[PDB]
Amino acid sequence: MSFWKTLQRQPRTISLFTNDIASNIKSQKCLQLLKGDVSHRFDVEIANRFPTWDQLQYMRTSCPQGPVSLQRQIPKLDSVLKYKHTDPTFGMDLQKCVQRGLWNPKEALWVDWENKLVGNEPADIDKYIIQRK
């Protein structure tokens, strides 16, 4: 009780995924996200890759939308949300497609493997652990 982030059980490792955005698809992703408040208190992780259910399998549980949130994060969900673009096009490295190909998205995926807190959105971080939690 009595805190700025006001939250129980604080994580540590912040796994942020990239899904196109602006200039620095990677930077603009989190870099820009954290470009909000201050930076510190926690360690921010900026990585660009496809939110495969393989690894998301963990978040898929600790989330109502789980993968849907991911597939829904990218454009043409119904496509990737199924087997479309989702194919070996976005699978491995979706950044190769999100990089600007297929579509030029601008969503930030924030997933916590410390507290098991995930949320497809850049605000999910600020809400949970902003640029400095």
Curated annotation (Swiss-Prot):
Q: What is its EC number?
A: 1.-.-.-
- The organelle targeting sequence, given as a residue range: 1-21
Q: Where is the protein situated, by its record's location annotation?
A: Mitochondrion
Q: Which cysteines are joined by disulfide bonds?
A: none
Gene Ontology MF terms: oxidoreductase activity
Which Pfam families does UniProt cross-reference here? Answer: DUF1687
InterPro entries (UniProt xref): Fmp46, Thioredoxin-like_sf
Coiled coil regions in record: none
From what superkingdom does this record's organism come? Eukaryota
Q: Could you name the active-site residues? A: 97
Keyword Aminoacyl-tRNA synthetase tagged: no
Where exactly are the transmembrane stretches of this chain? none
- Alphabetic keyword roster: Mitochondrion, Oxidoreductase, Transit peptide
Keyword match Mitochondrion: yes
Main subcellular location: mitochondrion
Matching Gene3D superfamilies, A to Z? Glutaredoxin (3.40.30.10)
- Cellular compartments per GO CC: mitochondrion
Q: Name one GO biological process term.
A: negative regulation of transport
- Family of this protein: Belongs to the FMP46 family.
PANTHER family attached here? REDOX PROTEIN FMP46, MITOCHONDRIAL-RELATED
User: Which protein is depicted?
Assistant: Putative redox protein FMP46, mitochondrial
Q: Name the species this protein comes from.
A: Saccharomyces cerevisiae (strain ATCC 204508 / S288c)
